Design a protein around this ligand. Structure first.
Ligand SMILES: O=C1Cc2cc(Nc3cc(Cl)ncc3Cl)ccc2N1
Ligand SMILES: O=C1Cc2cc(Nc3cc(Cl)ncc3Cl)ccc2N1
Ligand SMILES: [Cl-]
Ligand SMILES: [Cl-]
Lengths: 122, 4, 122, 4
């Protein structure tokens, strides 16, 4: 018999993104080629099957630095990290291939689905 | 607020 | 020119609640009288003006245990902690006074607003 | 997915 506040989840995600922009309580650096991205382990786990597996591992859960596969494009990762914290995906003709490949690697099934749909249309 |  | 996934914020919050239920990556214990509640500092900050102030403090940001004011009712806190992680508020005739008082202390303005509305109606 |  609970009541529900419709905007609560969106407001929580907006505040987590504000903490990220100000580098507050970030507990991991994701290294993609030369580029470094600070984030919250819990948010990465909540959005990605790959980060979920990494941070539930008894040894990896304690690492402050995670290095991604050298094939991963830093721009594709940046677009996906922004989507994790905002629900907004900057999908463009020039980045769609790098975004789909990065989403497949990160195991973000809903992003993979929209990339396949957008590629099929063109 | 709504009834979910 | 982004696209948006409507269910993303709700799905993120659902996964954060799953991490909480399994005690994964919880980094703080909130002590309310004899009762202890494990949580994620980032989620508490995103939902509460009080936790936002506590964990942005250069000294308190590093504490693993936070003790609330002895006037705070553990049941009222538990109802509010569940709301933080689910958007669902278990508001009942028998708990509304303890829930409103705890929400005022935690600085959760939307919960305070619905409690005042429900009290006014009765 | 929607146009926000
Ligand atoms: O496409 C996706 C997105 C995703 C997120 C997570 N993260 C969780 C899943 C569960 Cl059940 N509990 C907790 C967490 Cl943080 C796992 C796999 C995938 N695949
Ligand atoms: O009723 C409320 C809920 C709430 C949440 C937060 N938390 C933040 C606010 C900002 Cl601007 N950036 C980041 C965070 Cl985590 C502060 C005050 C209040 N009052
Ligand atoms: Cl996804
Ligand atoms: Cl609130």
């Amino acid at each position: 018999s609970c009541i529900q506040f419709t905007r609560h989840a969106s407001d929580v995600l907006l505040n987590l993104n504000r903490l990220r922009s100000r580098d507050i309580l970030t507990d991991v650096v994701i290294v993609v080629s030369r580029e470094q991205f600070r984030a919250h382990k819990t948010v990465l786990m909540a959005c990605s099957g790959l980060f979920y597996s990494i941070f539930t591992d008894q040894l990896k859960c304690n690492l402050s630095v995670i290095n991604l596969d050298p094939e991963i494009n830093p721009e594709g990762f940046c677009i996906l990290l922004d989507f994790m914290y905002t629900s907004r995906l900057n999908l463009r003709e020039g980045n769609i291939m790098a975004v789909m490949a990065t989403a497949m690697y990160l195991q973000m099934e809903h992003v993979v689905d929209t990339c396949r749909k957008f590629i099929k249309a063109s | 607020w709504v009834i979910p």
